[PDB]
Amino acid sequence: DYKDDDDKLDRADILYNIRQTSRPDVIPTQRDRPVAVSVSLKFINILEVNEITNEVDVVFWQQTTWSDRTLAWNSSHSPDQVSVPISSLWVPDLAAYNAISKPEVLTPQLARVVSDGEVLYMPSIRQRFSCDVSGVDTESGATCRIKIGSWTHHSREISVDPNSDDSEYFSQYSRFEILDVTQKKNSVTYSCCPEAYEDVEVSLNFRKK
Amino acid sequence: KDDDDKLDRADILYNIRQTSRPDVIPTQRDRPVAVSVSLKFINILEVNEITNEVDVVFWQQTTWSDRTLAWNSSHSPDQVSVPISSLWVPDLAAYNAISKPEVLTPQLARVVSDGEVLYMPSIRQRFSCDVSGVDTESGATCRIKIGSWTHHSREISVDPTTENSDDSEYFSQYSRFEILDVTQKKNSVTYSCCPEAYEDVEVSLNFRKK
Amino acid sequence: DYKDDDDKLDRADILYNIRQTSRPDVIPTQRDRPVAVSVSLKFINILEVNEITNEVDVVFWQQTTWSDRTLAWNSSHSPDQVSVPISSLWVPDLAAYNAISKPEVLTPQLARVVSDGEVLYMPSIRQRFSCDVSGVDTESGATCRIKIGSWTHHSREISVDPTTENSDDSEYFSQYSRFEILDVTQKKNSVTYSCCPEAYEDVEVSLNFRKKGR
Amino acid sequence: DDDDKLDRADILYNIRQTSRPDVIPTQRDRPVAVSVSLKFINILEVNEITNEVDVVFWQQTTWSDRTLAWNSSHSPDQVSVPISSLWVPDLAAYNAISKPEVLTPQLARVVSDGEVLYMPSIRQRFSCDVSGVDTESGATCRIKIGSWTHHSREISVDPNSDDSEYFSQYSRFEILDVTQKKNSVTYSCCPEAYEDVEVSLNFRKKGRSEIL
Amino acid sequence: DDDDKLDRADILYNIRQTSRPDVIPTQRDRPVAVSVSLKFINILEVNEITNEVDVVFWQQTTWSDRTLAWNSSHSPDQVSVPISSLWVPDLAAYNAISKPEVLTPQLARVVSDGEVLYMPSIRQRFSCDVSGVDTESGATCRIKIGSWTHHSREISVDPNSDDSEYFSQYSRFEILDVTQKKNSVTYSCCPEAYEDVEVSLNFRKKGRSEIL
Numbered sequence A: 001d002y003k004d005d006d007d008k009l010d011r012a013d014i015l016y017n018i019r020q021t022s023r024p025d026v027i028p029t030q031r032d033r034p035v036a037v038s039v040s041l042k043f044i045n046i047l048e049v050n051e052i053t054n055e056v057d058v059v060f061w062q063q064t065t066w067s068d069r070t071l072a073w074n075s076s077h078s079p080d081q082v083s084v085p086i087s088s089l090w091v092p093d094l095a096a097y098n099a100i101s102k103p104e105v106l107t108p109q110l111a112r113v114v115s116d117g118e119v120l121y122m123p124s125i126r127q128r129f130s131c132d133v134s135g136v137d138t139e140s141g142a143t144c145r146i147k148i149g150s151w152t153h154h155s156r157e158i159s160v161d162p163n164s165d166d167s168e169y170f171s172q173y174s175r176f177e178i179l180d181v182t183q184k185k186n187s188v189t190y191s192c193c194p195e196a197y198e199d200v201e202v203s204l205n206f207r208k209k
Numbered sequence B: 001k002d003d004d005d006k007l008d009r010a011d012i013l014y015n016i017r018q019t020s021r022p023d024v025i026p027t028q029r030d031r032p033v034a035v036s037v038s039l040k041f042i043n044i045l046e047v048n049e050i051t052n053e054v055d056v057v058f059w060q061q062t063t064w065s066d067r068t069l070a071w072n073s074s075h076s077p078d079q080v081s082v083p084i085s086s087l088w089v090p091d092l093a094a095y096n097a098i099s100k101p102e103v104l105t106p107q108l109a110r111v112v113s114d115g116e117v118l119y120m121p122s123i124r125q126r127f128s129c130d131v132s133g134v135d136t137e138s139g140a141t142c143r144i145k146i147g148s149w150t151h152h153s154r155e156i157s158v159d160p161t162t163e164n165s166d167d168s169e170y171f172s173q174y175s176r177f178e179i180l181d182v183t184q185k186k187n188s189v190t191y192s193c194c195p196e197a198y199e200d201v202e203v204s205l206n207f208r209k210k
Numbered sequence C: 001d002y003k004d005d006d007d008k009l010d011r012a013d014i015l016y017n018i019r020q021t022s023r024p025d026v027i028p029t030q031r032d033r034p035v036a037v038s039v040s041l042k043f044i045n046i047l048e049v050n051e052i053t054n055e056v057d058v059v060f061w062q063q064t065t066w067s068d069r070t071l072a073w074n075s076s077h078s079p080d081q082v083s084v085p086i087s088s089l090w091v092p093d094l095a096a097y098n099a100i101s102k103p104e105v106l107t108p109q110l111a112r113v114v115s116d117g118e119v120l121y122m123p124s125i126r127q128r129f130s131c132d133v134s135g136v137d138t139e140s141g142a143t144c145r146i147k148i149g150s151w152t153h154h155s156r157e158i159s160v161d162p163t164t165e166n167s168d169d170s171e172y173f174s175q176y177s178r179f180e181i182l183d184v185t186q187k188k189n190s191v192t193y194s195c196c197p198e199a200y201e202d203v204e205v206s207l208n209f210r211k212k213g214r
Numbered sequence D, E: 001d002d003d004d005k006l007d008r009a010d011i012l013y014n015i016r017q018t019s020r021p022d023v024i025p026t027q028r029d030r031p032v033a034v035s036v037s038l039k040f041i042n043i044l045e046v047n048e049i050t051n052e053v054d055v056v057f058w059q060q061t062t063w064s065d066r067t068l069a070w071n072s073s074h075s076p077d078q079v080s081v082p083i084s085s086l087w088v089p090d091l092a093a094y095n096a097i098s099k100p101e102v103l104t105p106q107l108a109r110v111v112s113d114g115e116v117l118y119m120p121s122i123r124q125r126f127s128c129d130v131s132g133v134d135t136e137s138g139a140t141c142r143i144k145i146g147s148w149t150h151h152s153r154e155i156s157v158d159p160n161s162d163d164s165e166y167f168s169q170y171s172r173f174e175i176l177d178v179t180q181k182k183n184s185v186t187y188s189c190c191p192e193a194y195e196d197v198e199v200s201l202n203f204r205k206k207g208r209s210e211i212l
């Protein structure tokens, strides 16, 4: 409940309870079903676009949510959420398939845990990608796709789930402007292994101002 | 007179470490942590009017209280330095940063016997902001918003310090740029999707090429 | 058992067992024989090519597998595989002998351990190499060779062998890159130095590529 | 007795028993006297456009902690110690615009009388006055260094040479003079001062006269 | 018996029980003798204006700690050991102008007779004499390597080839000769000397066009 959110001892006790119960290295599968992970990229900036190399340098807020109901507690007289270092938590092992630089995390590495077991982790990331930059100087713009999913968990273990112009988020001072952002679910079988991986394809349709 | 009593200092640090919860916000009573922050600009290193990006160095003055850390300093040190890893510090971020904050200074805070904490890292960082007009007489106005990344307004308030007349007092005379005005104001951020508001300080840096 | 994959307590128990048994700093030699490590590079991108200095910056999936039967478990009624942080496991001490930067790991540092004891570690790596870049802007392209093997274990301790599947070597290469891969070979190779009797078994990867024409 | 290995291990143990790495080693209720001397080795880059220099210096840093002393009548006079086992002064350069990059093993020497010597080779960029670098009298780039969080009552930081024994002969530049002077700074708001050292690096480009 | 896994695990346990990673392994109150041999792999960038070079080399580093030795009559002769479990010499290059970037797994070999071999591949930049690089006789770039904090009484650092087994075919440069000569450095202010190896890299631009 709101009134108790700022009760420090309660917050300390919740963090203790979460660290007691959390298994940071085991997927939080419940009821023999895959962990349902939702990913939403809020684009903040498009910093460099190279039409010769088909590369983009971007900043996005990666809103990542899933549940671990073993973390839940009765918050009828305690805080409903706390901030938790992600090192204390399991986090989905997401990777961007067409990323060509390491992800630069620009923000404090803390997640929110809600008393119903919901977890929210939303880092600001700067990262470079190989994608189709063709058309960026035209009115219809370019469409750059970013493909994200679990790097080591197949669809039986983790599933990823997905039409905005990101007006609340995207920098008005970018040389570029966003026309549309859409996400589509993807299921892929790769050469290495017989089971499929789920991914989200995020399509960033943008153009130079 | 007691500042240099080493055993006293050791005991204060012991006490602080016994009491400190580095991962828990220090909400006293049932009120949000009152965090004060002010950027004292030290340098403007690179500016790009085409890309609207700036590279700057600033003192990030950060202060708050945790009364549980207070001690009787009648016959002991009034202040000690403490590694920030031993303390809770606010999870501040700049919303329009496009690089990680590069901390240039030792990551030590000062804890005062009344429980006041002062952390002031010197930081180099790059931002996306309005660089238009930087070569004109009236200059460009680049705004930086700084707030708690994961704590909403009910948990942490991030407000300007009481002093902002000194925001460019420590600015390098050897910069290619000169600062015309700095304001630092309360600002609240909300998103249509969700109930949380985030309290930040909006810093408006008005500057121009010399 | 694939039906038991989402049994969380089972996964946690398997992880516990692996960590009790694993010796992260000791080679998993079985039967006084060398550890057979398989390595195959699947190329994803070529980021920079410097004709002046003969250097290339590349992104590749480093497919790495080996066995440690001591990690094996009965999976008749439990998960067939789990993900494990590589810090809990022995991993081969591989290095590229002509690399001129650190390998930059772009993906989560987790391996897969299979119930028969096989381990699969496949990081995406961005790394720079010194190699032959002449010909890149011609029809027949440039050929850059990368040699990968154990840095400290000679052939008596570790054998580093290629896989025989190469059809996917450029299958995940970016369609948007300025470059295109013409051919890839991955072959067994052995290096010895005149000073000493040790041989080092490695995989030699030959990457034939060119700049796409207008 | 220097190479008596067991003696060295015992000294390291004794130091780690008594060392308080996060507490200033104030003795007899006086400030810690910290000596600093920058021995410049290389001037890597000078940007006349931006007033920036990129340099390498050896940061000779000394102070005492008598609690670390031992009787060395029949034991080693000195050992090397990882600085993570020691208190070290929280020095910062006020006009640094990059992180200090330490190029050398992060070990200090501890002497049996309790003297500590820490001398990293540091590469770091500074904002300073580079005008005149192409003239006969050269540029003078001043670097201000002191304790970032300790006032003069807690730490005092204290310091003429042309650095000929240290500066690279192969540098593009040559050093005319390096001066290092005591500097006390009090901020208007508050009563307590910081003790700093002002290092003045007077240098110039070799072969200033060119054919254009 | 090399591949007996339990044997290797027991050897690593024994090494970790006896190893003092922070204490120099002096035997018989004599200095630790460290051998260093740089195998040059590549010369990546050279600048004759600033006298800087960017190179890659394998740093073959060897020394003994007999306390680590074991009877290998019926056990492995050698094992790989993370260097964090071992004392390693605190070597530094005096004229380095960037930090040593270690490109390889940080593992050493320990031999059952107590011999230790650590050989990182290192990329690093140096200030040295690059003059003559575009001539037949070439430039000679000297790199001075020694213990950073141990003087000659504590550590001794001791060492002709063209490195044709190691040097990259694809360098824009070629090696004429690499020599390594024992050297010793002393400074006027202080008594002790530092032993170092002086590595003389004689090299030149490959396949250069000449005026004849």
Ligand SMILES: C(=C1/CCCN=C1c1cccnc1)/c1cccs1
Pocket (backbone or CB within 6 Å): A063, A111, A112, A120, A121, A122, A123, B148, B149, B150, B189, B191, B193, B194, B198
């Ligand atoms: C989250 C925001 C917006 C303000 C910045 N921090 C956060 C945040 C909140 C919680 C955890 N991590 C970061 C948002 C979520 C949806 C729209 S915005």
Ligand SMILES: C(=C1/CCCN=C1c1cccnc1)/c1cccs1
Pocket (backbone or CB within 6 Å): A150, A151, A152, A190, A191, A192, A193, A197, C042, C061, C063, C110, C111, C112, C120, C121, C122, C123, C168
């Ligand atoms: C590996 C893939 C493809 C799908 C993404 N994850 C994996 C994976 C599987 C196991 C461990 N680490 C990553 C491949 C490697 C080579 C061709 S496919």
Ligand SMILES: C(=C1/CCCN=C1c1cccnc1)/c1cccs1
Pocket (backbone or CB within 6 Å): C150, C151, C152, C193, C195, C196, C200, E060, E107, E108, E109, E117, E118, E119, E120
């Ligand atoms: C060592 C080599 C050559 C193969 C690469 N690794 C090693 C190695 C071997 C052991 C430890 N660290 C690296 C050599 C030594 C002399 C000539 S070669």
Ligand SMILES: C(=C1/CCCN=C1c1cccnc1)/c1cccs1
Pocket (backbone or CB within 6 Å): B108, B109, B110, B118, B119, B120, B121, D147, D148, D149, D187, D189, D194
């Ligand atoms: C603080 C200064 C000025 C001198 C440098 N360090 C500090 C400092 C002090 C405390 C903690 N962290 C850094 C100032 C505050 C107001 C005017 S100046």
Ligand SMILES: C(=C1/CCCN=C1c1cccnc1)/c1cccs1
Pocket (backbone or CB within 6 Å): D060, D107, D108, D109, D117, D118, D119, D120, E147, E148, E149, E187, E189, E190, E194
């Ligand atoms: C110290 C030197 C010379 C260069 C080698 N190492 C050291 C060193 C010695 C001890 C600790 N840290 C570094 C000097 C001091 C004064 C003139 S020279």
